[PDB]
């Protein structure tokens, strides 16, 4: 059964670097692209990027360019994002995105 675990709360200091991760199971991890998203509080969601565990081909947003380093690992079945030199305007909520194998929209 498919699931995406995520740690709910994370407290940090501005100007430092934090390692956010989410866990993948129920499917085969190398057969799907993964996306990450940001909902600014008092605003809609913002899509940041696109990452594949199979090869490691990355994709960023230009407004997040050099801000997040999308990298993953295939042994423990998880993907990472890692915001560098964090400021106050990125105090927000975050999810990691799973679509169907077709991949129109984010199912789980």
């Amino acid at each position: 059964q498919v699931q995406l675990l995520q740690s709910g709360a994370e407290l940090v200091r501005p100007g430092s670097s934090v390692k956010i991760s989410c866990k993948a199971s129920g499917y085969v991890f190398t057969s799907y692209w993964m996306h990450w998203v940001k909902q600014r509080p008092g605003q809609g969601l913002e899509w940041i990027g696109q990452i594949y565990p199979g090869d490691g081909g990355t994709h960023y947003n230009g407004n997040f360019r050099d801000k997040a380093t999308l990298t993953a690992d295939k042994s423990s079945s998880t993907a990472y994002m890692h915001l560098s030199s964090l400021t106050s305007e990125d105090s927000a909520v975050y999810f990691c995105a799973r679509k169907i194998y077709d991949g129109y929209g984010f199912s789980y």
Binding site: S25, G26, Y27, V28, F29
Partner: protein
């Protein structure tokens, strides 16, 4: 063995097979069950018929 002139036809329907020709993909959790079996031209497709 003496033979009699009583002949009986038999016949199977179209047996099929479909999958990945490179490697079998297993379920991620259950590491004993297959998802798509591995089938190419190169396998010995040995049959095992049964008779009444």
């Amino acid at each position: 063995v003496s033979r009699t002139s009583i002949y009986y036809y038999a016949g199977s329907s179209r047996l099929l097979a479909v999958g990945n020709p490179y490697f079998s993909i297993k379920s991620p959790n259950n590491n004993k069950k297959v998802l798509v079996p591995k089938v190419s031209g190169l396998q010995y497709r040995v049959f095992r018929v049964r008779l009444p």
